[model samples]
Target: RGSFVEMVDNLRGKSGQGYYVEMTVGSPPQTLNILVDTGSSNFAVGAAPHPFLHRYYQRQLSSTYRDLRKGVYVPYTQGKWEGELGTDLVSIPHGPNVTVRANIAAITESDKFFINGSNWEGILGLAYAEIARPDDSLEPFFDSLVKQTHVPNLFSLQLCGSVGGSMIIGGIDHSLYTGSLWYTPIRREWYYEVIIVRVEINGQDLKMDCKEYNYDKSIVDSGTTNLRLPKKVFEAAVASIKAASSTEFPDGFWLGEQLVCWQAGTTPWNIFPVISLYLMGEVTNQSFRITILPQQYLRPVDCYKFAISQSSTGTVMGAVIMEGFYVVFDRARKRIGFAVSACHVHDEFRTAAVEGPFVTLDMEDCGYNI
Candidate 1:
């Protein structure tokens, strides 16, 4: 059992592209559906009404709301927000039966953060204080939960496909996974950081320096939609897949500007080869390979675009890859764990798998010198 079990809504529809969890804030209970984002720190809610959001968190109605007098500007790849930092009494329906002191960002101005037809009104960042804008004095919402409520220091996520998934804030439910978890150390206290040593295309190694695979920081970010990698890495990866599969498409297709589709009932899933990442294991000089299937790699931006994207910065294992396994952010132990998720079974098919505690490679120095 977990300290709190919040139902997750992740149906693949126009308004539902990411995971959303329900929670309320303030004394009068201003309900907001927040996106479960582990990529950044700072639990921000829409404070002012916007065309995209149906409702905003009314801080004025809450008797216990207090303005911290600090302004914060949080930025993301897709959008940014400007908000005033504040404090509020927050409560989760099926979670801990108590109101906790949560630091809230009352977002007044934002860019593309809230899309025209998206469902979530806020973002619940589950990362560390280092990345928290406005400084560490502004403790993130989840940090306040674990400290004030005395709950466990870790959380686990099961992000399934169309039907959605679950997020356990404290303890792990052994029944949710099939076998033991393979854990890797958290390189730093920032995002669920990890060092990736290599990449494989259908078991064919994309030979390069260990440093290349980890050009920048490599992290497990459930918030991102695609399997993100550095520019060069992304180019090489797709090139390898293309070379091996004898597949070709327009240039923009790789950039998500176009889509490659088959007949209504037929899929091109078989044309793509398996992809793998060798992440440094918890044990000294050892690594583990987590493999993802074509079904998991191809996402429907329009029936589907190869769910892999290039980021100028950090390397990330996003929902495209994460949907394949159950991820555990073990903050207490400074490591992350992964096991085959129970929800991965879809019409008698397993879309993800993991292997190896293989020997570690030299040039161990990876990560973007974070």
Candidate 2:
């Protein structure tokens, strides 16, 4: 495997939080700072000029670039992007010289994407190409890397709280995590969709009330800043927190969407119980449970908050709940894996610093126990 490790930035602003990566385009390598999003499946760049990556993808600059003259459109909660589709030589020159000829979206028109002085120059979709637009048949950049390069068929994420995270391409870094990797089969190829059997809090099934909910259709999206739970699931989680601890929350207080919050110094994570997510395994038919600690939800700042919201689109395990876990996306086997991350404590809040070396995990170590 032609392995490479790239550093990802934890972007924070009024809009919310996210993670970004650095890559170069064209033969001469024009650097572009792009968001690393697992929720989406199209590669697009800002058409407007900015200080960072001074110029967007100029088709005339690269000899390998091709003008497709096709238009693309993407809609989001924050804003939208309409652009022209084409092909370009995309390269990640940091760790290893990994390059691929990929379909690129040069944004011709946009809205809130470039507002508020955002530093990101573009968007890089990590999801499969099945959801990609202009032509759903088009291969995404990462998929192109697998078919046309010496890289392997996997990628891993180590998201940090205070510092930026690291993304390992083509392989896993055993040194970054502890314990065995708990593998779960992918329910869908478009997103990193997994079979979520149940959401349990202190042995109580929270999603038991929602007969409309499906156990096999939740997404693990790094692009989303906070976790989105079903209505019934969110209610159950809040009720569990109140019942388990004496802490009080503010009336009508809410974060992005529905993430309930409290005043500073009011959170009680030490006494708060854990929330376990049970995922169905494809090969063994056994269920794998991922336990989330209370410290993972409380922020270090002056706020007693929970980083969860309600979404009608179903359950989405976002970066907030996923920071402490080393997540693996295995395309070759069509599965996903998770292990306890060997992260550094950033503050009293228990947010981890995601800086470390790369060491491969033993597949055999990921046995039936976990």
Candidate 3:
């Protein structure tokens, strides 16, 4: 086991949306809070005096900061960032005090990106280099960790009960979760994209209309706030949830934009059906279950609210849905692993949460297991 770097979860975002970690840059080490993003690939910090920049990176102050004379433009769902490219000594606190000379996009302009108002001073991209712009191409922070530091090629993300989470670089801490880490092959290197065997609600296949089984891929993105399903799947899932709660509380409520809330005092799991995500275990050629228990879906509130909605495009498993499980991104093996997080409730439906990796269904079978 090599030395690991622990990133403190700075839980700050609009309506509980973003998650971030802290890192120091430059020779004197200017501490900056960075948003941990898996959806995009680029490491950028705010330039001081800019409105979006809470604490800007002054290129002149650092002895190691070197200007590359290159400009970078990063586009996000809501905003974009324009900046100058440079290199600096980036350090993370832990054993060995790992510091790497890595590329940094010193952001001078931020347009419509909410990160300015949030606690984050910068954005730390964790995805592969392929997604990065050709001119801005550079090894991501974690990739640099693997090559330059004692950290392993793997990283684990454990989002705690709302507000904070932990990111383990180099390896997984067994204490963070129970059961075997079920592995799913990364369909694409740009993001932690994996093949989905099937998705079901209340034991009914959400993609029931399609007779031919397709190798549908889903990106498990921490950057995204809500779970986005296909239009048909979303409609079916919403209907199932509404039908189940109709007897108790006919009225439905919305929390923020995506989450749906209901009357208090009742666990939605007991009322609503469990949503199961079957993922392909490419190495073993088996399919494993990533069950989304009702408690996992229900947002922590006076009223029972579920955080999920429809995606305009394809499927994306966002932060709220992933908070229920301990997710491991193994770049070296080109696979993503999943295990129930410690915050999850241990139940029969979630036996996968406790046991070692076992095939729940055959890929050819394309069937539900509940």
Candidate 4:
């Protein structure tokens, strides 16, 4: 809900075959509209039989796509999309619009996410696994991509909300970002695990107790607009922050007035409190706590909320903590870098250019997504 950076280069138009194509599950393709998403790694489209968003856009069926039904399945935090997988013909406007074949779902039981959702039809998870899954029956979509393309592919997540928001394929918006790409290693399960020493709020240190850090799997999900920590540990962190300040926000969300708020030409956001994850083999540490969105007008409803919940599921961490930093997602390297930069990446748009990502427009063609 702030300023967003503009993409200097245009990778739109044809010739870029297989750039941002999405698929349904089956042998014959049921092609639908897809938005480039770094927030996830599962390729999902609204089924013809299912009443989901983008139902108005009649899907074109093709014979090129094949289903990978040899006992492959995918699951999510919500439910499972286990079905026969196949490929189909896809015609993209931005690229050559060739009849490229991709995975499809012949039958699925996923609930329609939102009817009032933004314009795009389905999602092409560009984060990591495009066909493999961690705990679910559905394989990640990226796993299949690696097998088919047989080329070294990487994903880039450039969050240009509102003003031309985007997720680039292959690389990043090199012109806008600076410095080297910070990287880590992804575990066998496809998510990156890291360790944290502690979090510092205005020079105050808040460390996790024995129950705070888990030495298992933790993911860097761009799909999650917020920083989601373990429930127990997060409660401890909030208690610590509250203990330090009595000045409070109108709602239970947001930092108090006495808390740190950086503005342009004023104090910059503090980059400390490395949130760590202890993986099986190695320990990855990441810097947390970036800038907060500084909208000139914030109503009671406009205030930030710490916990994220829907009518169904609930999780911690929203978009606030990713402020004022350069997030370099090196999925191939199985590592990611969250660097402190003078410039802000998120809310860097010019308003008019911003569109609903899950519904309409392209985040990036050859740059960032996950």
lDDT by residue (71-126, candidate 2, tens digit) is 88887788888998888888765434667898889987887776444556788898
Weakest lDDT window of 10 consecutive positions for candidate 4: 351-360
Q: In model 1, how large is the Cα lDDT of residue 163?
A: 45
Model 2 misplaced regions, further than 4 Å: 1-16, 50-55, 207-216, 254-267, 299-301, 344-370
lDDT tens readout by residue for model 3, 5-25: 344342334434578777889
RMSD in angstroms, candidate 3?
4.6
The lowest-lDDT stretch of 10 consecutive residues in candidate 3 is 208-217
Of 1 and 2, the candidate ahead on TM-score is: 1
Deviating ranges (above 4 Å) for candidate 1: 1-16, 76-78, 345-350
Question: Compared with the true structure, what per-residue lDDT tens digits does model 1 show for residues 189-211?
Answer: 97888888888998898887768
Candidate 1: pairs in clash:
none
Look at candidate 2 and tell me the lDDT of residue 334. Answer: 89
Q: Considering every candidate listed, which one attains the maximal TM-score? A: 1
Q: All candidates' TM-scores?
A: 0.93, 0.83, 0.83, 0.60
**Residue 143 C-alpha lDDT in model 2:** 85
Instruction: List the candidate numbers ranked by TM-score, top first.
Output: 1, 3, 2, 4
User: In candidate 3, which residue ranges exceed 4 Å CA deviation?
Assistant: 2-15, 94-96, 115-117, 134-136, 207-216, 249-269, 283-285, 300-306, 345-370
- Model 4 spans > 4 angstroms off: 1-40, 49-52, 56-60, 67-84, 89-100, 106-108, 127-139, 187-189, 214-216, 249-303, 307-318, 321-323, 340-370
In model 3, the Cα lDDT at residue 1 comes to 44
Residue 244 lDDT (model 3): 61
Count steric clashes of candidate 4.
76
